[PDB]
Amino acid sequence: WEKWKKLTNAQRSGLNQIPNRRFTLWWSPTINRANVYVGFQVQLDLTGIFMHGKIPTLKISLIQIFRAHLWQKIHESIVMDLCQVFDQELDALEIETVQKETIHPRKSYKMNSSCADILLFASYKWNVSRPSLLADSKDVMDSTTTQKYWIDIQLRWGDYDSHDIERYARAKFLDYTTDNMSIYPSPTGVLIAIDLAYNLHSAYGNWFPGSKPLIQQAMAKIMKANPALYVLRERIRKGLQLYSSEPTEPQNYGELFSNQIIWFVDDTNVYRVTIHKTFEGNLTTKPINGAIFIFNPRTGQLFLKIIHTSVWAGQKRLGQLAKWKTAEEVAALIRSLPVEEQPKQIIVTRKGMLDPLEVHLLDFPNIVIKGSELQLPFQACLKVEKFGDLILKATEPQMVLFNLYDDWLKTISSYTAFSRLILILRALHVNNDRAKVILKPDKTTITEPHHIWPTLTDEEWIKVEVQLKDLILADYGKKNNSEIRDIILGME
Amino acid sequence: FPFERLYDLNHNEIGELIRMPKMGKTIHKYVHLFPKLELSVHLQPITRSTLK
Amino acid sequence: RWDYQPDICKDYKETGFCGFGDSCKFLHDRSDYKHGWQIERELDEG
Amino acid sequence: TIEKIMGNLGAADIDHKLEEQLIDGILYAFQEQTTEDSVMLNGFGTVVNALGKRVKPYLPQICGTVLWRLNNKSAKVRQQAADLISRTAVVMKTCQEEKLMGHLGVVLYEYLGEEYPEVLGSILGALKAIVNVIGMHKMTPPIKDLLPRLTPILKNRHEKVQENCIDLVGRIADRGAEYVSAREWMRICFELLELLKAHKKAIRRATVNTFGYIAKAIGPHDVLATLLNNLKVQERQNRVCTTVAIAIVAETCSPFTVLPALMNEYRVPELNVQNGVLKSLSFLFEYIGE
Ligand SMILES: [Zn+2]
């Protein structure tokens, strides 16, 4: 926060309004909420912000942010970009023509009724589902057909009391489609809600084949890329006088740590054999216990489903029947799970094992399953002392749960704890020995018995981050005579 | 829009295919000008080795 | 309603200079730009 | 090396993946920068100067980098990113960066509010080096709003920001000059009258040139009236510059327009002004010649 000439009387006195102005802009979704006592509602001038009073400090901040018709320019850029996406993918989607309605220059900031933005002309016919949320999957493109689609973009500026944009998009859709003033040139379309104060987005409407992934991707790219939005965000930052400190502006995991679950599964080492020779010259090996690794890094949670060789008796060949077990086991997992730890997308090391669990997971068919394009060193979780001996001497196949994020979620992110983890896992993967000596540098570094890793400080933590990554690079060089990020993280 | 079902539409629904309704009637002109024939035929046997 | 008169310190806007400086209870802004009613009226007359 | 190399040779044979890793190592070097050096600047300038039209697809990348730097906390990196913009300014357009060169235009119009002279000067430099490529009548902030914003900066009493500001206003008054009102030009005249006391001589020569351009755009008579009243000041630095400025106005707009007023002012009974008149005729006969 923001570390001659001779002035007239009223310059050498009277307060400075600028720090008051920026305190109000910062605290502004609270100072300007919707649930008030007495207060008469009013629309900011050329936009769709509501005030419920007269707070001149706040009104001045907000007005000077949205100068020069920035609100409509935002509406116009967002509609153009959607158009262009359809300009391009006409082919796969059967779009014969794309119709951008020549704009009412006030459609963006009239808030109780709506023209439409995009008119979609099929080639032949679309069969179309019932409406659901842009975050809901199972869609039955059966109910009707048409050549006419409309698409709506509605911008709001939410506040502390009300910034859920799912229910916003739902209510605006239901209402605006069953009202008697909004002229929709079809009985079918979609509504896309942007929340400019919180940079949120979603949509509700009647869908057809392709629409869900198409929009999902186009929206997530606009919200990041669009140039109007960039001018918005930039007037906001400069009216706050906020600066970043990170250089470099700090792939899936920007999708992955989200409040929606994603699991990481390792079943490459559930079957292992330990080899020692006979008096006979033949090096005979004894099978040993294993473990399915299920990970949630937005939590630091492992389910360790240890496999017993109780199942090595009369099952013919190891690997594919092991695929089969892992499948039915994760199925039982989802069965036993409660309604706030239910998984949403699960990525396994074995891209060859998706199919058996694919089929087995139909009792819980909401599961986006995938094989991970970035392997993460849970195979290096065979190395540690607690987990290993646990598995090794267990007798009955079983479940355990660890929080690898020992105390970290108090003073780092799930982001940062996941990154640091990747460091540690790959460090056991690559050396295990320089790993021991790097992560226990001080002679009397300790671990609390419920920890996977010691009790450090931030100083040596940053030092050892650089150290472990130095090691990963050193060893890549030794055995081979964006890149650093992705080698740290996983596959390439 | 098959070479079979193209005159199955009129120059309204013919142009309804690719939504180019200033060109639909010219399209139908091209179709109806492409020589296309039907035919009817009767077969009656003379003997087990001949059918006229 | 429509909140009609924005608060455009007109000494600043026209002459780049407000005698009050930091305490001007209006918006220091030299931006010419079509208003909230100019456009409405011109378009409807068009 | 690479800079020397491609600067002498050209970048004809540099293939796809090669140019990629090059542009990327470039971005790195420039962020990683930890010294105040023209090393990485010139490297960048040359490398894109030779990539010519090869650079189209990374303009999101290149700018996004530069902009995130423009957001930083410490002045130095901010200033650096302003510099780098002033380098690549020409190719920014020449690859037809509607969204992107539009970006840089309006976003710098934003940062015109800085109060670190070291960044404000570089911002003015970058705006000037954009306006050079893209002319006035398609500038992204129309100069009709730019120059009104610039006039309150001419009072910034610092050599670098003053240098670059008077440069930008001199460009505009030379070529733009008609997207602004007579009254604006008059106020800006009154502000120039006290750049003539900067401690650096580049500033003062730029000031005199723009008095010339303003005399071309508006007529000479009001600017000449405002110059005589300055001759009445003391402390000779101002008189020497204004008397130069009078000579310049007379040279551009023919000397018969100004000679009667000068001669008549030779009658006010004060010393500094009679000597101002004589010195101005000195410069005038030098400048017009035959
Ligand atoms: Zn003021």
UniProtKB/Swiss-Prot annotation, chain A:
Quaternary structure, from the entry: Part of the U5 snRNP complex. Component of the U4/U6-U5 tri-snRNP complex composed of the U4, U6 and U5 snRNAs and at least PRPF3, PRPF4, PRPF6, PRPF8, PRPF31, SNRNP200, TXNL4A, SNRNP40, DDX23, CD2BP2, PPIH, SNU13, EFTUD2, SART1 and USP39. Component of the U5.U4atac/U6atac snRNP complexes in U12-dependent spliceosomes. Within the minor spliceosome, which acts on U12-type introns, interacts with PPIL2 and RBM48. Core component of U2-type precatalytic, catalytic and postcatalytic spliceosomal complexes. Found in a mRNA splicing-dependent exon junction complex (EJC) with SRRM1.
Disease annotated for this entry: Retinitis pigmentosa 13: A retinal dystrophy belonging to the group of pigmentary retinopathies. Retinitis pigmentosa is characterized by retinal pigment deposits visible on fundus examination and primary loss of rod photoreceptor cells followed by secondary loss of cone photoreceptors. Patients typically have night vision blindness and loss of midperipheral visual field. As their condition progresses, they lose their far peripheral visual field and eventually central vision as well.
Protein name in UniProt: Pre-mRNA-processing-splicing factor 8
Tissue specificity note: Widely expressed.
Record's subcellular location: Nucleus; Nucleus speckle
Region (Involved in interaction with pre-mRNA 5' splice site) location: 158-492
Residue range from the parent sequence: 1503 to 2015 of 2335
Region annotation RNase H homology domain: where it falls in the sequence: 252-492
Primary gene name: PRPF8
Segments of this protein annotated with the region Restriction endonuclease homology domain: 70-241
Ranges where the record places region Important for branch point selection: 4-15
Swiss-Prot record, chain B:
Distribution of this protein across tissues and organs: Widely expressed.
Signal peptide range in chain numbering: none
Entry's localization field: Nucleus
Assembly with partners or alone: Component of a core complex containing at least PRPF8, SNRNP200, EFTUD2 and SNRNP40. Component of the U5 snRNP and U4/U6-U5 tri-snRNP complexes, building blocks of the spliceosome. Component of the U4/U6-U5 tri-snRNP complex composed of the U4, U6 and U5 snRNAs and at least PRPF3, PRPF4, PRPF6, PRPF8, PRPF31, SNRNP200, TXNL4A, SNRNP40, DDX23, CD2BP2, PPIH, SNU13, EFTUD2, SART1 and USP39. Component of precatalytic, catalytic and postcatalytic spliceosomal complexes. Component of the minor spliceosome, which splices U12-type introns.
UniProt note: domains: Contains two helicase domains. The N-terminal helicase domain has catalytic activity by itself, contrary to the C-terminal helicase domain that may have a regulatory role and enhance the activity of the first helicase domain.
Family in the record: Belongs to the helicase family. SKI2 subfamily.
Record protein name field: U5 small nuclear ribonucleoprotein 200 kDa helicase
Gene: SNRNP200
UniProtKB/Swiss-Prot annotation, chain C:
Disulfide pairings: none
Chain positions of all zinc fingers (C3H1-type): 3-31
Subcellular localization: Nucleus; Nucleus speckle
Transmembrane stretches, start-end: none
Tissue specificity as recorded in UniProt: Ubiquitous.
Quaternary structure note: Component of pre-catalytic and catalytic spliceosome complexes. Interacts (via N-terminus) with the spliceosome subunit SNRNP200/BRR2. Component of the minor spliceosome, which splices U12-type introns. Within this complex, interacts with SCNM1 and CRIPT.
Disease: Trichothiodystrophy 5, non-photosensitive: An X-linked form of trichothiodystrophy, a disease characterized by sulfur-deficient brittle hair and multisystem variable abnormalities. The spectrum of clinical features varies from mild disease with only hair involvement to severe disease with cutaneous, neurologic and profound developmental defects. Ichthyosis, intellectual and developmental disabilities, decreased fertility, abnormal characteristics at birth, ocular abnormalities, short stature, and infections are common manifestations.
Name by which UniProt lists this protein: E3 ubiquitin-protein ligase RNF113A
Range of the intact protein held here: 194 to 239 of 343
Curated annotation (Swiss-Prot), chain D:
HEAT repeats: 140-178, 182-220, 252-290
Post-translational note: Phosphorylated. Phosphorylation occurs concomitantly with the splicing catalytic steps.
Sites annotated Interaction with RNA: C165, Y179, L271
Location(s) in or outside the cell: Nucleus; Nucleus speckle
Stretches the record annotates as Interaction with PHF5A: 286-287
Domain of life: Eukaryota
TM spans (from-to): none
Subunit relationships: Component of the 17S U2 SnRNP complex, a ribonucleoprotein complex that contains small nuclear RNA (snRNA) U2 and a number of specific proteins. Part of the SF3B subcomplex of the 17S U2 SnRNP complex. SF3B associates with the splicing subcomplex SF3A and a 12S RNA unit to form the U2 small nuclear ribonucleoproteins complex (U2 snRNP). Within the SF3B complex, interacts directly (via HEAT domain) with SF3B3, SF3B5, SF3B6 and (via HEAT domain) with PHF5A. The SF3B subcomplex interacts with U2AF2. Identified in the spliceosome C complex.
Family affiliation: Belongs to the SF3B1 family.
Functional summary from the UniProt entry: Component of the 17S U2 SnRNP complex of the spliceosome, a large ribonucleoprotein complex that removes introns from transcribed pre-mRNAs. The 17S U2 SnRNP complex (1) directly participates in early spliceosome assembly and (2) mediates recognition of the intron branch site during pre-mRNA splicing by promoting the selection of the pre-mRNA branch-site adenosine, the nucleophile for the first step of splicing.
Protein name: Splicing factor 3B subunit 1
